[PDB]
Amino acid sequence: NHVVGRAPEPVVPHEQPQEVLRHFSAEERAMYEQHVKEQTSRQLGEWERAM
Amino acid sequence: EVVERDAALMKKTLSSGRRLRHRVESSRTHRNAGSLS
Amino acid sequence: DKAVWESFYRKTGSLDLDKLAESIKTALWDATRKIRSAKEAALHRSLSHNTRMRASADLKHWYEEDANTLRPLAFEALKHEAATPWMQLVQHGKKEEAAALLKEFEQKGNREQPPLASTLKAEDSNPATIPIGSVHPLFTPALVQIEEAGGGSVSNEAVCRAQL
Amino acid sequence: QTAVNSSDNPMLSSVTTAAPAADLSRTKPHEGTGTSERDPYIRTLHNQR
Amino acid sequence: ITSRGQFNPIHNFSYAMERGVRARDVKAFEKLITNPGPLRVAYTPDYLDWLHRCYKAKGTYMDARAVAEKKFNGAPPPGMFLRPAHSFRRLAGELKRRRAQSILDEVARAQGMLDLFERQPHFPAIHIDRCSRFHLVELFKEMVLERSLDSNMIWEKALLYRAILSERKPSYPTSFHYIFTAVEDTVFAPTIHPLAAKCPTLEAYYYYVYLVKKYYIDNAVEAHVVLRCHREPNAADLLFSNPPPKDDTEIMKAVELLRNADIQRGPPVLPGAYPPIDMLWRCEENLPLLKVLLFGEFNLIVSENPFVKFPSAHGFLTRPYSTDSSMSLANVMAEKRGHLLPSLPRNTATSIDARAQDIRRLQQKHHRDDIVSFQKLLRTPSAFSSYSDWSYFNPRAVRAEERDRLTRKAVEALKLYDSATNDIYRHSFEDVQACHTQRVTERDRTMPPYLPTLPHFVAIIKKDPHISFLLHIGLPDRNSSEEGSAKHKELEKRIYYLARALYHTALEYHNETVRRVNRQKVNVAASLLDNFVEQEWTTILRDKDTQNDKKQLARRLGRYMLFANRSLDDTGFPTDARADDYTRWMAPPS
Amino acid sequence: KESLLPNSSSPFAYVEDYMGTNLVFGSPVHAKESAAVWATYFERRYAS
Amino acid sequence: RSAANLARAEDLIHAVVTAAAQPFGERRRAATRDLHMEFQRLAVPVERVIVANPVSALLESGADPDEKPVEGEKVNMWPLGAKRVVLYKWSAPNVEKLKAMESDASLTAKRLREIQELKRRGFLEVSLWRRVTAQERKQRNEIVEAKKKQVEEVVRTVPSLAHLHQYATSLYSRIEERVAEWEFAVLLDDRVLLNKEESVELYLPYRDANGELLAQGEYRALVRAFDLEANPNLHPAYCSVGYSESFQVFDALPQLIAQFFRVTHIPAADFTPFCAFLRDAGLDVPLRCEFEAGQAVTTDGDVYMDYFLQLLRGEAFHQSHAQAGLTEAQRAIEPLCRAHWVVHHPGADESEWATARRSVLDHAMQHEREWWFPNEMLDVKDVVTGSTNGLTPQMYPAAVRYGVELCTVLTAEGKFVDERGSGLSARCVVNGTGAAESVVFDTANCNGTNTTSVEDALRVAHGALRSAQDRHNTLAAFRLGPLSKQSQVLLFCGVNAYEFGGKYARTYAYAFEKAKKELEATAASGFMAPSLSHEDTERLS
Amino acid sequence: DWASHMQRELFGEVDPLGGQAHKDYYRDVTRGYSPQYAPRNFANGGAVAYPHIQSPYEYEEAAHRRVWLDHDVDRMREEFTQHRASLRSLASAQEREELLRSRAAEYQVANTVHESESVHPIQQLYNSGGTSRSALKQQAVADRYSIAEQHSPLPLTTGVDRDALDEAQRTKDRILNDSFTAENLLITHGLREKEKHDFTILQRTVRIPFQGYDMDRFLAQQKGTPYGAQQLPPNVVPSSMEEAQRTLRGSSATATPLVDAVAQKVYARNTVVDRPAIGEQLTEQIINIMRASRTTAEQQREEERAQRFGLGRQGALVQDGGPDQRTLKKHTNDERIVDAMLFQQNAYRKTPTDEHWNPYIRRSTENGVGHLLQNKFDIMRREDRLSKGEQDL
């Protein structure tokens, strides 16, 4: 009942634990964020277009 | 003998004594300046 | 084929210069890519026929020298191309013909062709001809002393002296 | 997923705590270092088609 | 090179000692330390002692070096021998040492000077008695003016210093007396007019007296805090002081008393506008006020934490504590998640709200203890060091970057000094005779031509047909259009990331823990690059035949091999090893 | 600037032995210094 | 002995090649004199140029702020370490626009911004030219001629150098940038932004930078004016020039030092009235300089006069505006960029370099930074000891590779303008591959008539690709050059470390011949190699 | 609006926190002793949220990026001087604020703060408890360097020197060599074979796991994917502030290169030491401490390696029964065993391909696939097939 129109929850390729992320430099963490942002946006948008 | 000499030199880094420092008197309004007398 | 291609770029039309630029850029890239492929090809033929290097089992032989690494190097073009015929002769280690050309120099005192096709002819592709000084460029200044004072070929005398 | 660690049970008293798996190591096609299911002590799946 | 609470020399002893001028008695040394020129740097006894000892040691050093060189007419490392003087290698080495040591000297002194005008404790007082308009104006324009964003705050700073000096007069030491000449000599614009545009009003001055009396300001430090918080809408709240502020009846009464008592010698609102800044520095009339201002900055600075006295202003002046809180979590997470996802099942919602509470509790619990433990941990180079971490607040504290530049310069100089060792000194002859017995051999005995180096990898990932095509041809031209330069920047940046990742993997390849993590950095980087390439490639093909054009050339290249699924080892080349082995080596951490 | 070192671009101008010695094309000071170095060395060698 | 001969050769080669470059310089300078003399007929003159005493900002007790009445009439002489104010009148449109917009100017962030951009739009360059006695001119003519003689003898003795001459001339004519009494002394200001006041305080230093001291004698101040609309990319020919009247330059210290003390030490009472005394003679003693001169001191509290002088006379506490405009970083790479710039401008004067200095170094530190910046792998800290100390035989081929990949990946840029008169011009950006990352035509310069055949656009792009590939080759020579030269000393004189030196040389040669012979049989066997095991062979011999 | 505040601090020649110790700001070395924001995360629990540098090469690189960015930080300084002169010129609050707003937009100050983008409720939790947008913007402090980083070329050069790279190669070599030696020694004592056997013993006990009646559903629910199947991570009890801070700083202390470590320590000690010095005597003292440090560390590594593999002669060299005498104890490394082991591997061996006259040895894939790739064609094919995620032929 709850889930009917909704998108699948975005699945980000090579998503990281907190314990690996703790070793990313400030710049590499910015990059990680860029990656997650882009995957999430791409997928959710793809679902919009699909539906 | 070389390596002996350098271990002998890294012994001298822990042989550091401290020289006695000299506290001054804290005030609320300024800093006190002592000079050698 | 100006007949065919001219109106593609317009010309009365005014030139694109955008289309024209992209196509120049692309053409150049194509040429360069042919060069690089030729280099790598040479490397490949060598590796596949060389059994001693095959004996040590190394995948790394195939990647340790690639188009970037092999010669001719592009950023070295000038000093090799802008060079006089004499200079090119000595650069490629032909001391005989360079000395000859030098004596004749003293005593008597858009084109299509690579500037080196003058000095380097067919017969200098034979690996038999390549002087030992020139063989391994990395070490050239050291391997030059094994060589004869005038001749490209190694001098028994010098090497025996050194050993003795 | 089993540890080759030593057990206090009487049947397992022969079992000795294993050194950790070797780091960059090239195995024989029928063995693995035994870390995960993806990498068993004994590779059961054939490598053919 | 500097760390917290380190002493640095501001004196150049070397120049005079090379001329042969040396001191013996302590009186001689005090005579060596006193600037004739206008400025007077006082010292703590401690710093003075340290400096003295250093001086003596430098005497002994230059002495023994000179005596050694008179006997021979430095002293080698243990297994080494001195090359001859007038040998190229030794001349070069010694030169290198001369230069490196001049650099290290200059740096030492520069950091000393930073300490001096940052008002570090061992330089307790800078005295200006001997300065003339030039020195004062210059000191002002280098120290006060340049730094300040706001013009109008400078005047305030001045009057407030005048008020503090005038109110605290008994407790100041004798060496300060001269400055009071400048305080009684201050010229004010008549009450509401030729000086109205030149100088400030007396009313203003009494406002600031009100502030010194009401908040008990003893310092340039609390001055700083008060002056930043007082014009703001929350003023009563920010500046509310731990010993509570006096009630305005008594204060305004004492201000009436001062105003009146000073008339017979010849809730107040925050004051108005003041004359444009330049007047202060360029009118003779303001010259005493200016003087006070300088004296206010270079002295009147004391260690004490102003945030013991103004505990509510700590959040405003410097950043607030994260453990201190000035909807439900579930609703925030709903807002980020967007309307396109199912709302959180209300189990997980409730569960997450529970965590949010438990975390609130952890914060409240650990707020004090973390602070305490932190300062205690700093008081104990060591893991904890800095240019400035001091317990006390310093409004003139130097920017971290000025100090770091010096430090870096000094470390270059050190590495330079260390180089020259192998130029000046040499190994035993027969040791190198021996050494030349094992020749360098190309194949084995020489390091391999592919080491980890950033351009090696950048080259490797730019050598791919698809990416080489995308760089040169594929993207719209970088100079021609905006999309061109944008796409170009991003492609280049992504290559760069993947290159840095491969590089740091290659360096640490031998140690497993670090390698698996660095490997995850490679995965993220490569994934980013692959998505960019894939996208731009599709764009090339879709975008709207003719022989040898862009699209044909692209379709000739074939399928794009993803950088993610590439298996490259330490040297940046594909592996020798079986896929199952390589996969295991690079597997994620647990 | 004034220093004692040959003024030339080529590094080949600054080449000497490992022992800091040049008995060819060295300045007269260098030459005496270096012949003295080798003299001392061989004196000790043939002594022992 | 052979190392000595190598060095000797490189010295000669350097002489010969330089002597080949000078005439290019004369012709370039001539063409630029010409082009400039044309352009200045049509452009906005810089009419009044006057050197004057700087006017104190300080006011007396009864004065009021606003006037700015005194510019000073003029000045007969400019002391060495002193500030003077040069006044210019440049009536160019943007300057007018500035005077108007500022005289209208209680303040808005917007208008502040507008004013600052309007200031950045044009700029002035101020320099000091010195006169020359016929005596000095004859001494220089004499020295130049003696050098030319030495070069002619050298070339005569050793034929191959006479050949290298023709080489260098033919290279310069290709590499070079095509262009279609008083001697320069100092650059006081690289970029003076536009003012409503039309004046600059300039500090003259004690030292021009090649590091030399400044002479005495007559100087006039030259002022160049550039506006970035009429002359983007800042060609040196297009600009507006005017000169001040002559004045006298000298170093005043030894007079004033003599006048105040009537001098190795200074007693410490006098120090502060001494510095005051100096500032009244016009000299600039900064505050810090006083302060440090005072911090190195005799037993008696004295100031060493030579330490004080050394501080006054050097770049530490005050600089030419021209040198303050540059970063620490830029000043560190400057001799490299200058060397390179001079390869492409064969025979440049210090005047020319002075003009182009800012623009070149900004370009370098922006677009070129990878080429110019010091590179711990490639770079050489020292020439004498580089072969021995920094570079190991074990690290050598790695470092060579590093150079090669770096150049492969980096990028160079080049320009070409059409010689046949349409303003068609191309820019190119080029890899270490020879490939072109970018090619662009610019129709801006050329008129609306166009009518340029595809042929001519092709010729233009050809020329641009050329100049670009050449820039890239030259940059690579400078990036990889030092390390490769020291590599040469390592391998040539350090043979006996290697397997091709000494007793093992003979083995290498042997291996070499076998390889050759072996290649032959592989070519005979159809490029399938014989057996390693030599199972293939007819005879046991 | 927080952005204008940050910009305000960037313009100032004064340190933003006034040099004072603040528990939430790590003054980091790597970052040039600059006050970076590093709160404790109580959702992860006890852990200071901030980068932990894991190698010296990371340090050396970051230091280099600072040197590279120098020129830009300098142009920026020169530009800031102009800016805050303009700020002095402006007499009204609101206009000043307009200037700061527009200029903070231009320098992209806001773009320095990196917020977690994850839509997943759990990652949401981890970041958003302690470190959130609301918090991160309010708490962030920008150095000039982090601003120059954004408008600037990217360096192709790590700060690593020729010699530093020499030592890197040597270190990697040495450690790899000893690890391979150690592993072969475990195979030789047959402890690996034992480990396999014992695994087989442990199998006796185990059940086959319940995989569910609907196996898809089951697997998925184990992973927490289906709807309402989300579990929260187990709450961890936070560690004392000293512990967390010591982890964070110990990390970057380990990573400090020799020169910096020594130099910092020498100067800092020179203040308190009994016989202090300035000038060249100090420099000397540093160089000596450094050279001695290298030598001592070398010698210590050799002794360690000796203890690990049991290298070195046993007892007296001149024993009656010959020099040779040695004793081997069960599962214990010894010099003799190491060298016998290598002897077995390569005894008269001329090349690794020596035994490849034998077809069944030649196509063994044990050592890797590298001897079986002969023409380029096949190599490329392998590359392709591997990238597609299929098997190598």
GROMACS .gro file of N, CA and C in nm, chain F residues 1 5-18 22-26, chain G residues 1-4 6-8 10-11 14 383-384 387-388 485-486 488-489 492-493:
model
  120
  892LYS      N    1   7.842   3.796  -0.840
  892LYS     CA    2   7.897   3.737  -0.718
  892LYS      C    3   8.040   3.686  -0.738
  896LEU      N    4   8.527   2.905  -0.845
  896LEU     CA    5   8.461   2.795  -0.914
  896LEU      C    6   8.461   2.837  -1.058
  897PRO      N    7   8.497   2.744  -1.148
  897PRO     CA    8   8.506   2.787  -1.287
  897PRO      C    9   8.370   2.834  -1.335
  898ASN      N   10   8.369   2.938  -1.416
  898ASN     CA   11   8.244   2.987  -1.469
  898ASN      C   12   8.221   2.921  -1.605
  899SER      N   13   8.126   2.828  -1.609
  899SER     CA   14   8.087   2.761  -1.733
  899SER      C   15   7.949   2.697  -1.717
  900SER      N   16   7.882   2.671  -1.829
  900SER     CA   17   7.751   2.608  -1.822
  900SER      C   18   7.760   2.456  -1.809
  901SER      N   19   7.860   2.395  -1.872
  901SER     CA   20   7.866   2.249  -1.877
  901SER      C   21   7.907   2.192  -1.744
  902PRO      N   22   7.836   2.089  -1.699
  902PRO     CA   23   7.880   2.021  -1.577
  902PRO      C   24   8.016   1.953  -1.597
  903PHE      N   25   8.052   1.923  -1.722
  903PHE     CA   26   8.181   1.859  -1.749
  903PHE      C   27   8.300   1.942  -1.703
  904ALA      N   28   8.280   2.071  -1.679
  904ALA     CA   29   8.390   2.157  -1.635
  904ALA      C   30   8.424   2.137  -1.488
  905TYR      N   31   8.329   2.084  -1.413
  905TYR     CA   32   8.345   2.065  -1.269
  905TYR      C   33   8.379   1.923  -1.226
  906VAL      N   34   8.403   1.835  -1.322
  906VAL     CA   35   8.435   1.697  -1.290
  906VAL      C   36   8.571   1.682  -1.223
  907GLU      N   37   8.573   1.611  -1.111
  907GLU     CA   38   8.696   1.562  -1.050
  907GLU      C   39   8.677   1.420  -1.002
  908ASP      N   40   8.781   1.367  -0.940
  908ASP     CA   41   8.785   1.230  -0.893
  908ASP      C   42   8.689   1.217  -0.775
  909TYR      N   43   8.673   1.097  -0.721
  909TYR     CA   44   8.591   1.078  -0.603
  909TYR      C   45   8.663   1.131  -0.482
  913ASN      N   46   9.201   1.662  -0.875
  913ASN     CA   47   9.216   1.674  -1.019
  913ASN      C   48   9.360   1.705  -1.058
  914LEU      N   49   9.426   1.610  -1.122
  914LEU     CA   50   9.566   1.629  -1.159
  914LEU      C   51   9.577   1.673  -1.304
  915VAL      N   52   9.461   1.694  -1.365
  915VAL     CA   53   9.451   1.745  -1.501
  915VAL      C   54   9.359   1.867  -1.500
  916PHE      N   55   9.396   1.972  -1.573
  916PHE     CA   56   9.313   2.092  -1.589
  916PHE      C   57   9.260   2.152  -1.456
  917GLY      N   58   9.328   2.126  -1.346
  917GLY     CA   59   9.292   2.190  -1.221
  917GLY      C   60   9.367   2.321  -1.207
  940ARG      N   61   9.085   1.442  -1.930
  940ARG     CA   62   9.125   1.524  -2.044
  940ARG      C   63   9.006   1.538  -2.140
  941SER      N   64   8.935   1.428  -2.161
  941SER     CA   65   8.820   1.431  -2.250
  941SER      C   66   8.706   1.513  -2.187
  942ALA      N   67   8.691   1.508  -2.055
  942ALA     CA   68   8.589   1.591  -1.990
  942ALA      C   69   8.620   1.739  -2.009
  943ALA      N   70   8.748   1.773  -1.995
  943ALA     CA   71   8.792   1.910  -2.017
  943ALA      C   72   8.758   1.954  -2.159
  945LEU      N   73   8.520   1.832  -2.359
  945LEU     CA   74   8.375   1.850  -2.370
  945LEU      C   75   8.334   1.988  -2.321
  946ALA      N   76   8.383   2.026  -2.203
  946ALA     CA   77   8.349   2.157  -2.149
  946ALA      C   78   8.393   2.268  -2.244
  947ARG      N   79   8.517   2.260  -2.290
  947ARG     CA   80   8.572   2.359  -2.384
  947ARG      C   81   8.483   2.375  -2.508
  949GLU      N   82   8.156   2.300  -2.531
  949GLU     CA   83   8.030   2.366  -2.497
  949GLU      C   84   8.044   2.517  -2.481
  950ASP      N   85   8.158   2.561  -2.429
  950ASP     CA   86   8.188   2.704  -2.423
  950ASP      C   87   8.190   2.769  -2.561
  953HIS      N   88   7.843   2.776  -2.722
  953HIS     CA   89   7.768   2.887  -2.664
  953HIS      C   90   7.804   3.021  -2.730
 1322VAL      N   91   7.491   2.236  -1.000
 1322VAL     CA   92   7.555   2.198  -1.125
 1322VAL      C   93   7.682   2.118  -1.104
 1323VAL      N   94   7.764   2.166  -1.012
 1323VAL     CA   95   7.888   2.099  -0.977
 1323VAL      C   96   7.864   1.956  -0.928
 1326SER      N   97   7.574   1.538  -1.075
 1326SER     CA   98   7.608   1.404  -1.124
 1326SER      C   99   7.627   1.306  -1.010
 1327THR      N  100   7.705   1.348  -0.912
 1327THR     CA  101   7.739   1.267  -0.796
 1327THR      C  102   7.628   1.252  -0.691
 1424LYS      N  103   7.186   1.673  -1.895
 1424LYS     CA  104   7.328   1.710  -1.903
 1424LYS      C  105   7.407   1.643  -1.791
 1425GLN      N  106   7.350   1.647  -1.671
 1425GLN     CA  107   7.422   1.585  -1.562
 1425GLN      C  108   7.425   1.434  -1.578
 1427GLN      N  109   7.468   1.300  -1.854
 1427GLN     CA  110   7.585   1.280  -1.939
 1427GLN      C  111   7.712   1.270  -1.858
 1428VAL      N  112   7.732   1.358  -1.761
 1428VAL     CA  113   7.856   1.341  -1.683
 1428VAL      C  114   7.858   1.207  -1.608
 1431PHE      N  115   7.928   0.923  -1.874
 1431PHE     CA  116   8.056   0.935  -1.943
 1431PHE      C  117   8.175   0.917  -1.849
 1432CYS      N  118   8.175   0.985  -1.735
 1432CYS     CA  119   8.290   0.975  -1.645
 1432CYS      C  120   8.276   0.870  -1.537
   0.00000   0.00000   0.00000
